[PDB]
Amino acid sequence: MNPKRIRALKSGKQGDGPVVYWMSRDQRAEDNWALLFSRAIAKEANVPVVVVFCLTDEFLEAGIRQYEFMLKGLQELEVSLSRKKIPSFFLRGDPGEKISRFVKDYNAGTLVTDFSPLRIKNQWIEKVISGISIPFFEVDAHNVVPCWEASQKHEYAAHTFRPKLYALLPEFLEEFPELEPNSVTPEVETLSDVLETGVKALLPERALLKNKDPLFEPWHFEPGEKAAKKVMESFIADRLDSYGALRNDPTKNMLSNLSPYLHFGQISSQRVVLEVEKAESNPGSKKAFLDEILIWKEISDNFCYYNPGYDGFESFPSWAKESLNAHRNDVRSHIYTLEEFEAGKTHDPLWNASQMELLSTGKMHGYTRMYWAKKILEWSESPEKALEIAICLNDRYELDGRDPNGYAGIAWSIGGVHDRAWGEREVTGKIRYMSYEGCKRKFDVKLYIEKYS
Ligand SMILES: Cc1cc2nc3c(=O)[nH]c(=O)nc-3n(C[C@H](O)[C@H](O)[C@H](O)COP(=O)(O)OP(=O)(O)OC[C@H]3O[C@@H](n4cnc5c(N)ncnc54)[C@H](O)[C@@H]3O)c2cc1C
Numbered sequence: 001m002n003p004k005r006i007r008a009l010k011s012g013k014q015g016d017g018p019v020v021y022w023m024s025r026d027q028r029a030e031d032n033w034a035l036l037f038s039r040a041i042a043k044e045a046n047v048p049v050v051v052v053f054c055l056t057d058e059f060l061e062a063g064i065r066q067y068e069f070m071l072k073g074l075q076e077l078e079v080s081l082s083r084k085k086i087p088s089f090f091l092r093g094d095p096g097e098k099i100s101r102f103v104k105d106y107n108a109g110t111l112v113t114d115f116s117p118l119r120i121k122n123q124w125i126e127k128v129i130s131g132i133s134i135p136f137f138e139v140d141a142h143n144v145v146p147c148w149e150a151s152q153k154h155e156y157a158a159h160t161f162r163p164k165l166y167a168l169l170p171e172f173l174e175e176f177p178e179l180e181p182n183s184v185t186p187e188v189e190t191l192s193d194v195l196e197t198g199v200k201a202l203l204p205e206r207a208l209l210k211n212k213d214p215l216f217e218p219w220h221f222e223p224g225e226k227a228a229k230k231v232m233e234s235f236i237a238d239r240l241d242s243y244g245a246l247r248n249d250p251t252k253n254m255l256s257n258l259s260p261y262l263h264f265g266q267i268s269s270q271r272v273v274l275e276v277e278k279a280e281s282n283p284g285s286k287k288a289f290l291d292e293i294l295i296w297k298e299i300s301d302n303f304c305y306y307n308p309g310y311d312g313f314e315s316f317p318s319w320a321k322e323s324l325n326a327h328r329n330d331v332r333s334h335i336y337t338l339e340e341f342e343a344g345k346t347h348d349p350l351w352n353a354s355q356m357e358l359l360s361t362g363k364m365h366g367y368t369r370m371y372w373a374k375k376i377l378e379w380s381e382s383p384e385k386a387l388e389i390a391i392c393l394n395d396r397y398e399l400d401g402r403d404p405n406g407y408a409g410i411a412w413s414i415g416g417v418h419d420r421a422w423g424e425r426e427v428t429g430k431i432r433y434m435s436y437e438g439c440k441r442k443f444d445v446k447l448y449i450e451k452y453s
Contacts, residue, residue: 010136017107026141026265029080034114034139048186054095076224085182096127115140117305154306228267244285250365259400300408316415323429356452362399373413
């Protein structure tokens with residue numbers, strides 16, 4: 001167990017009660033460095049380990065699609081942990097108040113959480129630190145290389161971050177030890193009831209079409225740790241060989257489809273990398289996929305961790321801010337409202353089809369995601385307005401949304417973060433431009449449009 005994966009958030013006097021794993025980002029029982037570290041500390045203190053999850057008040061800012069996907073996975077997780085004699089407690093409310101009250105009530109000895117660089121997690125940590133007196137640790141269970149270890153600062157390009165991460169792969173890319181069960185079972189409602197009341201509160205804002213029927217199709221991605229593994233095995237067996245050649249074709253389902261599972265932590269990216277590394281397939285396709293799940297995924301954590309304003313115009317590179325400022329008063333070809341973007345009511349049938357794939361499946365193809373967000377910049381009054389629209393639609397309708405990959409991917413599309421300058425155009429400036437005709441020369445756009453009416 002590498003001690004570089006864990007960071008001390010607050011020192012204190014250890015109690016003689018159970019070690020509490022405040023699970024948040026990595027919702028799985030296998031391949032969880034945060035849970036394994038909590039079990040190790042619990043063994044050293046001759047005390048059990050308990051898992052606590054907070055059902056926050058911000059779930060009404062998303063949809064049923066993300067709520068059901070997460071809760072149905074937690075229902076499976078509660079059974080997995082129970083077989084390991086590890087009890088799980090699901091609290092409903094503010095983590096600042098609920099975690100502090102749980103620590104005091106259950107006489108917790110040590111508190112551990114997983115790592116997320118998002119602003120809301122730091123808000124919770126701030127509130128929790130003020131209300132506890134026991135040691136508080138956080139463990140990076142999401143990245144193969146701990147975020148604070150891969151680089152000590154913001155990396156402006158993938159080619160500067162790539163050698164740093166690969167140089168540390170031999171140390172941190174390793175197999176997971178088995179989660180040892182608790183010795184004996186130790187000493188706040190049913191998840192089915194919380195799901196029922198939550199869905200009932202979300203129903204008025206459910207995405208519907210004109211026929212009052214729901215837009216979202218839940219059968220595309222089955223939630224849970226077991227289903228995530230089957231998706232990974234199917235990708236390695238059937239799709240990895242062609243990934244390098246077809247990853248930019250939205251008419252082919254050749255991606256791994258792992259992001260909903262990766263976002264909620266229902267599968268470990270380190271586990272996926274281990275299995276891909278030992279798989280025998282096209283070297284170009286393996287290089288391409290590993291570049292996505294290692295370099296681009298973990299550089300997104302790098303971006304949010306080292307840029308407090310990661311969701312703002314101020315985090316854009318200087319060349320992009322100056323370029324976009326120089327074209328602020330350029331006349332835009334079209335100006336669409338947030339409601340027109342949301343309903344897919346633009347003059348662009350390819351953009352509208354991309355929005356329909358997002359509305360119906362909750363996972364837009366990676367290539368059209370780049371086109372989808374760049375057109376928001378082109379058809380908005382300002383770069384700041386384009387950021388708000390793209391973030392709003394991304395976090396509301398993507399299953400993989402509200403994620404460092406989302407803010408870093410949007411910042412790449414609109415602000416050229418982790419990109420270079422291109423030819424100077426009006427409105428968009430030197431930001432990389434993606435044209436409708438350019439897409440037509442890349443893939444069968446007519447089939448993609450016809451698929452998502
Ligand atoms: C405008 C925009 C919005 C995006 N919104 C999200 C989002 O809300 N949530 C999200 O997790 N990702 C987002 N991405 C990144 C990327 O599109 C998705 O991660 C990827 O498409 C998810 O589907 P997949 O698992 O089948 O991809 P795969 O090709 O099978 O890659 C596997 C994993 O590698 C990672 N990965 C792949 N591509 C990227 C990438 N471009 N950036 C960062 N990580 C990557 C992902 O974790 C991904 O799950 C967005 C990108 C853009 C340009």
